Structure 1
Amino acid sequence: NQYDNDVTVWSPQGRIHQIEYAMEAVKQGSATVGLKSKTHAVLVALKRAQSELAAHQKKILHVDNHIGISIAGLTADARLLCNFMRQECLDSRFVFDRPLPVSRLVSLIGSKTQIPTQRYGRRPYGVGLLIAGYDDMGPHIFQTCPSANYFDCRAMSIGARSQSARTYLERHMSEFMECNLDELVKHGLRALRETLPAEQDLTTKNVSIGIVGKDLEFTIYDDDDVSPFLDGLEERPQ
């Protein structure tokens, strides 16, 4: 191939391979699940360890009091987009004194992520995000990609073996709108569980959860704060 070294080179089929190669970076990262009710928006991600001696990687990150993200792909590209999201939320609160609507923040991601895909020497962002937020329009689950394209979704899963989680959510998508918060998180956990192989299941060390909604600001539970959600579990069936 020779149409795959630069973002500024179009393939004869009508495609850009460097955007598609950047999309492969998202799939290699560990799975993360996002879903919402009428009142809450929940992010559930799978922490990953390179070795048992090393700790698990951060998957959920803070953006603002009403917005939180889960990452999938390159770490530095995730932190770079996270800092841009934080800055845009800070600028909105500095100027207007009101929280930045989720819809508009994701549109700013779409505008920024597009710039490097059209300039020579530049590259696409090697990270896909799941954005959970709450504003005047209620809870929101958003999806961003290496391609500047973004999606408003009821539920979504990205990363390794995310298809298994995607199918689970697709069956229970009508269930979520009337769901209690405790029941909503369990749905997100049960979707993330499908991604893992048959030998292993969700533990207190490899599960990270983020919740934002009408009740409370965005909060990340990691270790001891996670066990109340895992306890009360319907066993792994096949």
Structure 2
Amino acid sequence: MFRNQYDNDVTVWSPQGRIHQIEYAMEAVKQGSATVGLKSKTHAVLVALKRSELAAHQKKILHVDNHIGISIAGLTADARLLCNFMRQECLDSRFVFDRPLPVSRLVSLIGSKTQIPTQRYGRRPYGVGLLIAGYDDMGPHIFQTCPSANYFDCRAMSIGARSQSARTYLERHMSEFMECNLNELVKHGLRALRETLPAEQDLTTKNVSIGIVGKDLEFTIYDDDDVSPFLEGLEERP
């Protein structure tokens, strides 16, 4: 109620001692739909719950470079800007140094990209969280980014809408994932995505994209009926 005065700029503090317009950007993640992202020792899987059938094809999962891609939960102007930035970082790493770009490092580059706005007038926080899944020498990666300039390393996560259901599944089976196959790890991701869905709804190779990179595998976005073979094996919402 008093936060009134101090909530309408990103470059003003409150008596309470917190910037509310960064917290509102971190509510704008939730206006976008539930992406899941979970990895093993061989592969780093993403899944995306795509909110007409003719209109709004909605490209939630995006491919950044050979070794790396993302899935999108929130403001889509910002999703685009951030993804396009990452493509340039990795292009330049393979132009000068002639290698991939570490996923940790690339998520850190996005971190500082997304801090400038919040500590600048005439700017607003990039209103979107990513699930930034690459594979390095290191091994597979998931890296949650938040609409706030801070970010995480993850072995599983979900961000977007009613996405706590997924997060809960991904804690229950967190251990399974580490030692799963490509397709095992995928069905786990899809069952988190299906925990988010109402019980009256289902995956039904329709609201499923799957964005998997791994060891020889490059980041490949299975969509439409390239997700059918992964959902063949998955069975029994119960």
TM-score, reference length from structure 1: 0.96
State the SS of the aligned residue for 1:143: coil
State the SS of the aligned residue for 1:72: strand
State the SS of the aligned residue for 1:153: coil
State the SS of the aligned residue for 2:115: helix
Q: CA-to-partner distance for each residue in 1:34-77, whole Å, 9 max, x for gaps? A: 000011100001111xx455243110001010001000111111
- 1:205 aligns with 206
Matched-pair contact (CA < 8 Å) for 1:56–1:206: no
State the SS of the aligned residue for 1:90: helix
Q: Distance in 2 between matches of 1:114 and 1:41?
A: 27
Deviation at 1:168, TM superposition (A): 0.6
Deviation at 1:12, TM superposition (A): 1.6
State the SS of the aligned residue for 2:65: coil
Q: CA-to-partner distance for each residue in 1:80-120, whole Å, 9 max, x for gaps? A: 11110101111111110011111111110111110010011
Matched-pair contact (CA < 8 Å) for 1:67–1:218: yes
Deviation at 1:164, TM superposition (A): 0.4
Q: Distance in 1 between matches of 2:49 and 2:148?
A: 24
Deviation at 1:220, TM superposition (A): 0.6
Distance 1:185 1:67, change over 3 A: same
Q: Distance in 2 between matches of 1:22 and 1:36?
A: 27
Q: CA-to-partner distance for each residue in 1:155-202, whole Å, 9 max, x for gaps? A: 000011110000111011111111111111000000000111121101
Q: CA-to-partner distance for each residue in 1:115-173, whole Å, 9 max, x for gaps? A: 01001111100110001000011011001111110100110000111100001110111
The number of aligned residues is 235
Deviation at 1:231, TM superposition (A): 1.4
Structure richer in strand, relative to its length: 1
Q: Distance in 2 between matches of 1:126 and 1:203?
A: 30
- 2:108 aligns with 107
Q: Distance in 1 between matches of 2:54 and 2:68?
A: 32
Q: Is 1:19 matched up with 2:22?
A: yes
Matched-pair contact (CA < 8 Å) for 1:209–1:226: yes
Instruction: State percent identity of aligned pairs.
Output: 99
Deviation at 1:29, TM superposition (A): 1.1
State the SS of the aligned residue for 1:220: strand
Distance 1:220 1:53, change over 3 A: closer
Deviation at 1:226, TM superposition (A): 1.1
Matched-pair contact (CA < 8 Å) for 1:6–1:121: no
Q: Which stretch shows the higher mean deviation, 196-205 or 112-121? A: 196-205
Q: Distance in 2 between matches of 1:202 and 1:30?
A: 14
Which residues of structure 1 form unaligned runs of 5+? Answer: none
Deviation at 1:78, TM superposition (A): 0.5
Q: Which stretch shows the higher mean deviation, 139-148 or 53-62? A: 53-62
- 2:188 aligns with 187
State the SS of the aligned residue for 1:194: helix
